[PDB]
Design an enzyme around this catalytic site. Structure first.
Site, PDB file in Angstrom:
ATOM      1  N   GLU A 115       0.878  -1.153   0.000  1.00  0.00           N
ATOM      2  CA  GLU A 115       0.000   0.000   0.000  1.00  0.00           C
ATOM      3  C   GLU A 115       0.924   1.213   0.000  1.00  0.00           C
ATOM      4  O   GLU A 115       1.939   1.216   0.713  1.00  0.00           O
ATOM      5  CB  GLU A 115      -0.884  -0.001   1.248  1.00  0.00           C
ATOM      6  CG  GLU A 115      -1.348   1.401   1.663  1.00  0.00           C
ATOM      7  CD  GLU A 115      -2.219   1.393   2.916  1.00  0.00           C
ATOM      8  OE1 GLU A 115      -2.720   0.314   3.280  1.00  0.00           O
ATOM      9  OE2 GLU A 115      -2.419   2.469   3.523  1.00  0.00           O
ATOM     10  N   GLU A 120      -1.658  12.150   2.397  1.00  0.00           N
ATOM     11  CA  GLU A 120      -2.494  11.701   3.506  1.00  0.00           C
ATOM     12  C   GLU A 120      -2.249  12.526   4.746  1.00  0.00           C
ATOM     13  O   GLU A 120      -1.125  12.970   4.986  1.00  0.00           O
ATOM     14  CB  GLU A 120      -2.223  10.211   3.834  1.00  0.00           C
ATOM     15  CG  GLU A 120      -3.229   9.648   4.843  1.00  0.00           C
ATOM     16  CD  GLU A 120      -2.879   8.252   5.415  1.00  0.00           C
ATOM     17  OE1 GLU A 120      -1.729   7.788   5.286  1.00  0.00           O
ATOM     18  OE2 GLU A 120      -3.779   7.634   6.018  1.00  0.00           O
TER      19      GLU A 120
END
Length: 298
Positions: A115, A120
């Site tokens: 991932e 973010e």
């Protein structure tokens, strides 16, 4: 030569046609209600704004049910090696209670296909956090990038780290995320995935290389990346498989909800959920505005 375009996402409906809209309960347990494309369109959560593709959240209604409405798009196509370039005019702001992310996810059971979190953050964060989440046996070296290394072990349950912290690098430019990023009109995030590692470059609006948006980008001639994940402590090729691109904004949950109490949002309400449920107007800035999304292959 080096890189060629393999997938241009276009804009508006042609852009959304390239993603599946996720409607299951939030895997990160946020107070969010991911809706279908039809409902999103009907709620003004997706659309086009002067040629830019828009994806936002409900900033009008008191929330109920699973939580505040938002969307989570996951690409239909997947890529094993390549260069992903996103040019954003706007990203979800540094809004208390939110947790936006533009990231990639491997195929199969998480975290076995890897991932990559490209953009973010949570709540009132200032700096972007670039992070990898992998199965056991993957750590990175501390050099070759401009950001600040926060955790070196990419394993999602790494021994000396908070659960699912992964290996993260914090950008040093305050315009790399949320509020600051939006004040300058955004910028470009390019991330390269190779058999030897991953690199992520951040070019604030106006500072991008002359070939970054073209048909043949050559990362080898770009300035030092903001984050670089490499080194002999990881089998880069085996830890990440074919990745799908994902855009989402969740609220509260495992990270944002969990740290609500010790940060600057603690004064907004006793709990993250109470704030998100009762203050719709607070989330007007929680939207993506994409100029372009293009993927290249070696």
């Amino acid at each position: 030569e080096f890189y060629h375009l393999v997938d241009d996402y276009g804009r508006g409906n042609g852009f959304f046609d390239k993603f599946n809209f996720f409607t299951g309960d939030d895997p990160t347990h946020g107070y969010v209600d991911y809706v279908s494309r039809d409902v999103a369109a009907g709620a003004g959560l997706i659309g086009e704004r002067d040629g830019r593709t828009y994806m936002g959240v409900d900033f009008t209604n008191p929330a109920s049910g699973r939580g505040r409405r938002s969307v989570r798009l996951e690409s239909k196509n997947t890529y094993e090696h390549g260069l992903i370039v996103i040019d954003l005019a706007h990203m979800p702001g540094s809004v208390c209670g939110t947790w936006p992310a533009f990231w990639t996810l491997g195929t199969g059971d998480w975290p076995y296909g890897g991932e990559i979190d490209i953009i973010e953050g949570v709540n009132d964060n200032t700096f972007n956090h670039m992070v990898l989440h992998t199965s056991d046996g993957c750590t990175i070296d501390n050099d070759g990038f401009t950001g600040n290394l926060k955790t070196s072990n990419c394993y999602v349950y790494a021994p000396g780290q908070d659960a699912n912290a992964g290996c993260g690098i914090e950008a040093t430019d305050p315009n790399s995320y949320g509020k600051g990023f939006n004040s300058i009109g955004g910028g470009i995030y390019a991330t390269e995935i190779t058999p030897n590692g991953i690199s992520i470059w951040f070019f604030p609006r106006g500072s991008e290389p002359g070939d970054v948006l073209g048909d043949n980008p050559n990362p080898a001639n770009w300035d030092t990346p903001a984050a670089k994940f490499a080194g002999g402590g990881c089998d880069w090729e085996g830890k990440f498989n074919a990745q799908r691109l994902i855009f989402d904004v969740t609220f509260c949950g495992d990270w944002a909800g969990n740290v609500w109490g010790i940060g600057g949002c603690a004064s907004r309400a006793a709990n993250c959920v109470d704030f998100v449920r009762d203050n719709p107007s607070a989330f007007a800035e929680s939207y993506w505005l994409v100029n372009s999304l293009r993927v290249y292959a070696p």
